[PDB]
Design a protein around this ligand. Structure first.
Ligand SMILES: [Zn+2]
Ligand SMILES: [Zn+2]
Lengths: 196, 197
Protein backbone atom coordinates (compact mmCIF):
# COMPACT_ATOMS: atom_id res chain seq x y z
CA UNK A 1 0.00 0.00 0.00
CA UNK A 2 0.94 3.68 -0.28
CA UNK A 3 -0.60 7.18 -0.15
CA UNK A 4 -2.96 8.43 -2.86
CA UNK A 5 -0.41 10.85 -4.34
CA UNK A 6 2.11 8.00 -4.50
CA UNK A 7 -0.41 5.76 -6.42
CA UNK A 8 -1.21 8.47 -8.84
CA UNK A 9 2.57 8.82 -9.65
CA UNK A 10 2.82 5.17 -10.07
CA UNK A 11 -0.23 5.34 -12.47
CA UNK A 12 1.24 8.25 -14.35
CA UNK A 13 4.56 6.52 -14.55
CA UNK A 14 3.19 3.21 -15.92
CA UNK A 15 1.58 4.95 -18.90
CA UNK A 16 5.17 5.45 -20.02
CA UNK A 17 6.93 3.13 -22.60
CA UNK A 18 9.12 0.38 -21.13
CA UNK A 19 8.12 1.50 -17.64
CA UNK A 20 6.33 -1.47 -16.24
CA UNK A 21 4.26 -1.82 -13.08
CA UNK A 22 7.24 -2.75 -10.89
CA UNK A 23 9.55 -0.28 -12.53
CA UNK A 24 7.04 2.53 -11.91
CA UNK A 25 6.98 1.56 -8.20
CA UNK A 26 10.76 1.81 -7.65
CA UNK A 27 10.95 5.07 -9.55
CA UNK A 28 8.08 6.71 -7.67
CA UNK A 29 9.80 5.98 -4.39
CA UNK A 30 13.08 7.20 -5.85
CA UNK A 31 11.59 10.46 -7.06
CA UNK A 32 9.95 11.29 -3.72
CA UNK A 33 13.24 10.71 -1.94
CA UNK A 34 14.95 13.07 -4.29
CA UNK A 35 16.10 16.35 -2.95
CA UNK A 36 13.25 18.81 -3.55
CA UNK A 37 15.29 21.07 -5.83
CA UNK A 38 15.99 18.12 -8.05
CA UNK A 39 12.44 16.84 -8.19
CA UNK A 40 11.56 20.36 -9.33
CA UNK A 41 14.00 20.33 -12.27
CA UNK A 42 12.51 17.03 -13.40
CA UNK A 43 9.01 18.40 -13.19
CA UNK A 44 10.23 21.62 -14.83
CA UNK A 45 11.96 19.76 -17.67
CA UNK A 46 8.84 17.68 -18.32
CA UNK A 47 6.67 20.76 -18.65
CA UNK A 48 9.33 22.94 -20.34
CA UNK A 49 9.91 20.40 -23.14
CA UNK A 50 6.24 20.25 -24.21
CA UNK A 51 5.37 23.97 -24.29
CA UNK A 52 8.77 24.79 -25.81
CA UNK A 53 8.37 22.14 -28.61
CA UNK A 54 7.57 23.05 -32.26
CA UNK A 55 6.70 21.03 -35.39
CA UNK A 56 9.02 22.43 -38.07
CA UNK A 57 7.33 24.14 -40.98
CA UNK A 58 9.40 22.21 -43.56
CA UNK A 59 10.40 18.78 -42.23
CA UNK A 60 7.51 18.72 -39.71
CA UNK A 61 10.04 17.25 -37.20
CA UNK A 62 10.90 18.16 -33.55
CA UNK A 63 12.84 21.41 -32.77
CA UNK A 64 12.69 24.80 -30.86
CA UNK A 65 12.71 27.11 -33.89
CA UNK A 66 10.27 27.38 -36.82
CA UNK A 67 12.39 25.62 -39.45
CA UNK A 68 14.79 22.99 -38.15
CA UNK A 69 18.56 23.04 -37.76
CA UNK A 70 19.11 20.34 -40.33
CA UNK A 71 16.75 22.37 -42.54
CA UNK A 72 18.43 25.77 -41.86
CA UNK A 73 22.09 24.80 -42.17
CA UNK A 74 23.66 26.90 -44.90
CA UNK A 75 26.08 24.21 -46.28
CA UNK A 76 23.30 21.69 -46.85
CA UNK A 77 21.55 20.10 -49.83
CA UNK A 78 17.77 20.28 -49.36
CA UNK A 79 17.16 18.32 -52.59
CA UNK A 80 18.05 14.85 -51.24
CA UNK A 81 14.82 14.04 -49.29
CA UNK A 82 14.32 11.32 -46.73
CA UNK A 83 10.77 10.34 -45.92
CA UNK A 84 11.20 8.85 -42.43
CA UNK A 85 8.98 7.35 -39.75
CA UNK A 86 9.53 9.08 -36.36
CA UNK A 87 11.76 11.90 -34.85
CA UNK A 88 14.54 9.57 -33.54
CA UNK A 89 14.82 8.04 -37.02
CA UNK A 90 16.36 11.26 -38.15
CA UNK A 91 18.83 11.06 -35.25
CA UNK A 92 19.56 7.49 -36.47
CA UNK A 93 20.21 8.68 -40.00
CA UNK A 94 22.20 11.75 -38.99
CA UNK A 95 24.49 9.38 -36.94
CA UNK A 96 25.78 8.15 -40.35
CA UNK A 97 28.02 11.27 -40.87
CA UNK A 98 27.68 10.57 -44.60
CA UNK A 99 24.51 11.72 -46.39
CA UNK A 100 24.19 15.54 -46.18
CA UNK A 101 20.52 15.82 -47.36
CA UNK A 102 17.06 16.47 -45.82
CA UNK A 103 14.13 14.54 -44.39
CA UNK A 104 10.48 13.99 -43.81
CA UNK A 105 9.16 12.40 -40.50
CA UNK A 106 5.48 11.50 -40.25
CA UNK A 107 4.92 10.27 -36.66
CA UNK A 108 2.86 7.50 -38.26
CA UNK A 109 2.62 4.82 -40.97
CA UNK A 110 -0.23 3.17 -43.00
CA UNK A 111 -1.98 1.10 -40.32
CA UNK A 112 -5.63 0.25 -40.99
CA UNK A 113 -5.25 -2.09 -37.99
CA UNK A 114 -4.11 0.77 -35.68
CA UNK A 115 -6.23 3.32 -37.52
CA UNK A 116 -4.37 6.06 -39.40
CA UNK A 117 -4.34 6.29 -43.25
CA UNK A 118 -2.64 8.74 -45.80
CA UNK A 119 -4.49 11.74 -44.15
CA UNK A 120 -3.14 11.63 -40.51
CA UNK A 121 0.44 11.97 -41.85
CA UNK A 122 2.47 14.12 -44.25
CA UNK A 123 1.89 12.59 -47.67
CA UNK A 124 0.00 15.33 -49.55
CA UNK A 125 2.20 17.51 -47.32
CA UNK A 126 5.25 16.28 -49.22
CA UNK A 127 3.20 16.14 -52.50
CA UNK A 128 3.49 19.90 -52.11
CA UNK A 129 7.33 19.85 -52.01
CA UNK A 130 8.97 17.76 -54.77
CA UNK A 131 6.90 19.21 -57.57
CA UNK A 132 7.54 22.58 -55.77
CA UNK A 133 11.27 23.37 -55.30
CA UNK A 134 12.82 20.97 -57.82
CA UNK A 135 14.05 17.93 -55.81
CA UNK A 136 16.65 15.51 -57.25
CA UNK A 137 16.33 12.53 -54.84
CA UNK A 138 13.27 11.40 -52.80
CA UNK A 139 14.40 8.43 -50.62
CA UNK A 140 11.72 6.60 -48.67
CA UNK A 141 13.18 5.13 -45.42
CA UNK A 142 10.34 3.75 -43.37
CA UNK A 143 10.55 0.46 -41.43
CA UNK A 144 10.55 -2.78 -43.60
CA UNK A 145 7.36 -4.38 -42.19
CA UNK A 146 3.78 -4.08 -43.54
CA UNK A 147 3.25 -0.51 -42.29
CA UNK A 148 6.81 0.52 -43.24
CA UNK A 149 6.93 -1.07 -46.75
CA UNK A 150 3.22 -0.72 -47.82
CA UNK A 151 3.37 2.97 -46.76
CA UNK A 152 6.38 4.13 -48.77
CA UNK A 153 5.04 1.86 -51.62
CA UNK A 154 1.75 3.79 -51.98
CA UNK A 155 4.08 6.89 -52.18
CA UNK A 156 6.94 5.56 -54.37
CA UNK A 157 4.70 4.98 -57.43
CA UNK A 158 3.33 8.54 -57.11
CA UNK A 159 6.95 9.69 -57.76
CA UNK A 160 6.71 8.37 -61.36
CA UNK A 161 4.60 11.40 -62.62
CA UNK A 162 6.98 14.35 -62.03
CA UNK A 163 10.57 13.54 -63.09
CA UNK A 164 11.77 13.24 -59.46
CA UNK A 165 14.28 10.44 -58.73
CA UNK A 166 12.41 7.97 -56.45
CA UNK A 167 14.05 5.43 -54.09
CA UNK A 168 13.66 2.75 -51.41
CA UNK A 169 16.33 1.65 -48.95
CA UNK A 170 17.38 -1.96 -48.75
CA UNK A 171 15.46 -4.86 -47.38
CA UNK A 172 17.69 -7.88 -46.92
CA UNK A 173 20.16 -9.47 -44.61
CA UNK A 174 22.12 -7.16 -42.29
CA UNK A 175 25.88 -6.78 -42.48
CA UNK A 176 27.53 -9.20 -40.07
CA UNK A 177 24.80 -11.86 -39.83
CA UNK A 178 24.70 -15.20 -41.63
CA UNK A 179 22.21 -17.38 -43.53
CA UNK A 180 22.53 -19.96 -40.79
CA UNK A 181 21.06 -17.71 -38.02
CA UNK A 182 18.72 -15.64 -40.30
CA UNK A 183 14.97 -16.07 -40.36
CA UNK A 184 13.11 -17.38 -43.42
CA UNK A 185 11.24 -14.15 -44.18
CA UNK A 186 14.37 -12.02 -44.24
CA UNK A 187 15.96 -14.72 -46.33
CA UNK A 188 12.93 -15.03 -48.66
CA UNK A 189 13.05 -11.31 -49.14
CA UNK A 190 16.87 -11.06 -49.79
CA UNK A 191 16.72 -13.77 -52.44
CA UNK A 192 13.92 -11.83 -54.17
CA UNK A 193 15.68 -8.46 -54.11
CA UNK A 194 18.96 -9.95 -55.27
CA UNK A 195 20.28 -8.00 -58.24
CA UNK A 196 23.81 -7.15 -57.19
CA UNK B 1 31.57 -37.21 -8.28
CA UNK B 2 30.94 -39.36 -11.27
CA UNK B 3 31.44 -43.04 -12.11
CA UNK B 4 34.38 -43.36 -14.56
CA UNK B 5 31.92 -44.17 -17.40
CA UNK B 6 29.65 -41.18 -16.78
CA UNK B 7 32.48 -38.72 -16.49
CA UNK B 8 33.60 -40.31 -19.78
CA UNK B 9 30.24 -39.46 -21.37
CA UNK B 10 30.38 -36.01 -19.86
CA UNK B 11 33.98 -35.44 -20.92
CA UNK B 12 33.01 -36.28 -24.48
CA UNK B 13 29.64 -34.55 -24.61
CA UNK B 14 31.23 -31.31 -23.42
CA UNK B 15 33.62 -31.47 -26.41
CA UNK B 16 30.52 -30.63 -28.52
CA UNK B 17 30.19 -26.88 -29.21
CA UNK B 18 27.51 -24.90 -27.41
CA UNK B 19 27.47 -27.54 -24.73
CA UNK B 20 28.13 -26.27 -21.18
CA UNK B 21 29.47 -28.60 -18.43
CA UNK B 22 26.21 -28.20 -16.46
CA UNK B 23 24.39 -29.24 -19.69
CA UNK B 24 26.77 -32.13 -20.40
CA UNK B 25 25.86 -33.55 -16.98
CA UNK B 26 22.11 -33.01 -17.44
CA UNK B 27 22.26 -34.84 -20.82
CA UNK B 28 24.50 -37.53 -19.51
CA UNK B 29 21.73 -38.55 -17.11
CA UNK B 30 18.78 -38.17 -19.47
CA UNK B 31 20.59 -40.58 -21.78
CA UNK B 32 21.84 -43.21 -19.35
CA UNK B 33 18.32 -43.06 -18.07
CA UNK B 34 16.62 -43.93 -21.42
CA UNK B 35 15.50 -47.50 -22.28
CA UNK B 36 18.47 -49.47 -23.69
CA UNK B 37 17.19 -49.69 -27.31
CA UNK B 38 16.82 -45.89 -27.45
CA UNK B 39 20.45 -45.20 -26.49
CA UNK B 40 21.27 -47.99 -28.95
CA UNK B 41 19.35 -45.84 -31.46
CA UNK B 42 21.25 -42.71 -30.72
CA UNK B 43 24.76 -44.22 -30.65
CA UNK B 44 24.01 -45.92 -33.97
CA UNK B 45 22.53 -42.73 -35.45
CA UNK B 46 25.80 -40.91 -34.67
CA UNK B 47 28.16 -43.52 -36.06
CA UNK B 48 26.09 -44.16 -39.25
CA UNK B 49 25.55 -40.47 -40.03
CA UNK B 50 29.34 -40.04 -39.96
CA UNK B 51 30.11 -43.08 -42.03
CA UNK B 52 27.44 -42.54 -44.70
CA UNK B 53 28.40 -38.86 -45.42
CA UNK B 54 29.50 -38.07 -49.01
CA UNK B 55 29.97 -35.06 -51.21
CA UNK B 56 27.91 -34.57 -54.33
CA UNK B 57 30.06 -34.85 -57.47
CA UNK B 58 28.45 -31.72 -58.92
CA UNK B 59 27.50 -29.41 -56.11
CA UNK B 60 29.88 -30.60 -53.39
CA UNK B 61 27.07 -30.58 -50.91
CA UNK B 62 27.02 -33.17 -48.16
CA UNK B 63 24.83 -36.08 -49.17
CA UNK B 64 25.10 -39.92 -49.16
CA UNK B 65 25.14 -40.77 -52.81
CA UNK B 66 27.11 -39.93 -55.93
CA UNK B 67 24.41 -37.27 -56.75
CA UNK B 68 22.33 -35.09 -54.39
CA UNK B 69 18.54 -35.41 -54.35
CA UNK B 70 18.45 -31.84 -55.60
CA UNK B 71 20.90 -32.32 -58.44
CA UNK B 72 19.55 -35.62 -59.67
CA UNK B 73 16.17 -33.76 -59.50
CA UNK B 74 15.40 -33.42 -63.15
CA UNK B 75 12.67 -30.71 -62.79
CA UNK B 76 14.71 -28.11 -60.95
CA UNK B 77 16.17 -25.05 -62.68
CA UNK B 78 19.60 -26.54 -63.32
CA UNK B 79 20.59 -23.33 -65.10
CA UNK B 80 20.65 -21.14 -61.96
CA UNK B 81 23.39 -22.04 -59.46
CA UNK B 82 23.07 -20.58 -55.95
CA UNK B 83 26.50 -20.11 -54.45
CA UNK B 84 26.97 -20.95 -50.78
CA UNK B 85 29.76 -21.46 -48.19
CA UNK B 86 28.54 -24.58 -46.24
CA UNK B 87 26.03 -27.49 -46.21
CA UNK B 88 23.84 -25.85 -43.63
CA UNK B 89 23.50 -22.78 -45.82
CA UNK B 90 21.70 -24.84 -48.41
CA UNK B 91 19.34 -25.94 -45.70
CA UNK B 92 18.77 -22.30 -44.73
CA UNK B 93 18.08 -21.50 -48.30
CA UNK B 94 15.99 -24.58 -49.01
CA UNK B 95 13.90 -23.98 -45.83
CA UNK B 96 12.62 -20.77 -47.51
CA UNK B 97 10.55 -22.87 -49.95
CA UNK B 98 10.72 -20.36 -52.80
CA UNK B 99 13.89 -21.07 -54.78
CA UNK B 100 13.89 -23.36 -57.82
CA UNK B 101 17.53 -23.61 -58.86
CA UNK B 102 20.51 -25.59 -57.72
CA UNK B 103 23.51 -24.95 -55.41
CA UNK B 104 27.29 -24.88 -55.57
CA UNK B 105 28.75 -25.19 -52.10
CA UNK B 106 32.35 -23.88 -51.71
CA UNK B 107 33.20 -25.35 -48.27
CA UNK B 108 34.53 -22.11 -46.81
CA UNK B 109 35.57 -18.54 -47.75
CA UNK B 110 38.78 -16.90 -48.88
CA UNK B 111 40.39 -16.27 -45.49
CA UNK B 112 43.94 -14.82 -45.40
CA UNK B 113 43.82 -15.05 -41.52
CA UNK B 114 43.11 -18.79 -41.42
CA UNK B 115 45.21 -19.40 -44.56
CA UNK B 116 42.59 -20.57 -47.02
CA UNK B 117 43.03 -19.43 -50.61
CA UNK B 118 40.63 -19.45 -53.61
CA UNK B 119 41.91 -22.94 -54.43
CA UNK B 120 41.29 -24.12 -50.89
CA UNK B 121 37.58 -23.84 -51.32
CA UNK B 122 35.59 -25.14 -54.24
CA UNK B 123 35.70 -22.25 -56.71
CA UNK B 124 37.40 -23.65 -59.76
CA UNK B 125 34.86 -26.40 -60.14
CA UNK B 126 32.20 -23.66 -59.88
CA UNK B 127 33.71 -22.04 -63.00
CA UNK B 128 34.05 -25.35 -64.78
CA UNK B 129 30.31 -25.83 -64.25
CA UNK B 130 29.61 -22.50 -65.73
CA UNK B 131 32.05 -22.73 -68.65
CA UNK B 132 30.87 -26.22 -69.50
CA UNK B 133 27.10 -26.23 -68.76
CA UNK B 134 24.50 -23.71 -69.89
CA UNK B 135 24.01 -21.35 -66.95
CA UNK B 136 21.75 -18.28 -67.23
CA UNK B 137 22.26 -17.03 -63.61
CA UNK B 138 24.88 -17.57 -60.88
CA UNK B 139 23.83 -16.31 -57.43
CA UNK B 140 26.43 -15.47 -54.81
CA UNK B 141 25.12 -16.07 -51.26
CA UNK B 142 28.22 -15.92 -49.21
CA UNK B 143 27.79 -14.13 -45.89
CA UNK B 144 27.81 -10.33 -45.89
CA UNK B 145 30.91 -10.80 -43.75
CA UNK B 146 34.11 -9.02 -44.92
CA UNK B 147 35.52 -12.51 -45.50
CA UNK B 148 32.14 -13.54 -47.04
CA UNK B 149 32.14 -10.56 -49.37
CA UNK B 150 35.85 -10.74 -50.28
CA UNK B 151 34.83 -14.19 -51.47
CA UNK B 152 31.70 -13.11 -53.43
CA UNK B 153 33.62 -10.64 -55.48
CA UNK B 154 36.65 -12.66 -56.29
CA UNK B 155 34.30 -15.22 -57.91
CA UNK B 156 32.45 -12.35 -59.59
CA UNK B 157 35.65 -11.28 -61.46
CA UNK B 158 36.39 -14.73 -62.83
CA UNK B 159 32.75 -15.02 -63.82
CA UNK B 160 32.60 -11.71 -65.73
CA UNK B 161 34.12 -13.06 -69.07
CA UNK B 162 31.34 -15.58 -69.28
CA UNK B 163 27.91 -14.64 -70.56
CA UNK B 164 26.23 -15.08 -67.18
CA UNK B 165 23.92 -12.91 -65.10
CA UNK B 166 25.63 -12.81 -61.71
CA UNK B 167 23.70 -11.52 -58.72
CA UNK B 168 24.20 -11.02 -54.99
CA UNK B 169 21.60 -11.69 -52.28
CA UNK B 170 20.63 -8.26 -50.96
CA UNK B 171 22.01 -6.74 -47.81
CA UNK B 172 20.32 -3.99 -45.83
CA UNK B 173 17.74 -4.05 -42.99
CA UNK B 174 16.28 -7.48 -42.06
CA UNK B 175 12.47 -7.73 -41.84
CA UNK B 176 11.41 -6.49 -38.38
CA UNK B 177 14.26 -4.21 -37.52
CA UNK B 178 13.68 -0.58 -36.61
CA UNK B 179 16.30 1.87 -37.90
CA UNK B 180 16.89 2.85 -34.27
CA UNK B 181 18.78 -0.37 -33.46
CA UNK B 182 20.18 -1.04 -36.89
CA UNK B 183 23.80 0.18 -37.05
CA UNK B 184 25.93 2.54 -39.25
CA UNK B 185 27.45 -0.08 -41.56
CA UNK B 186 24.05 -1.54 -42.45
CA UNK B 187 22.44 1.91 -42.61
CA UNK B 188 25.05 2.99 -45.12
CA UNK B 189 24.03 0.01 -47.24
CA UNK B 190 20.30 0.80 -47.48
CA UNK B 191 21.45 4.19 -48.61
CA UNK B 192 24.43 3.13 -50.72
CA UNK B 193 22.22 0.17 -51.85
CA UNK B 194 19.14 2.38 -52.46
CA UNK B 195 17.22 1.84 -55.79
CA UNK B 196 14.34 3.18 -57.97
CA UNK B 197 11.14 1.79 -56.36
ZN1 LIG C 1 13.02 20.44 -40.35
ZN1 LIG D 1 24.58 -31.76 -55.60
Amino acid sequence: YYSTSVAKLIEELSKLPGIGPKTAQRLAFFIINMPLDEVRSLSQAIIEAKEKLRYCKIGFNITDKEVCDIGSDENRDHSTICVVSHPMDVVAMEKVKEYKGVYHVLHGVISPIEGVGPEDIRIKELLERVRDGSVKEVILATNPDIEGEATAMYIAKLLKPFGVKVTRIAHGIPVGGDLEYTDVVTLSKALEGRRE
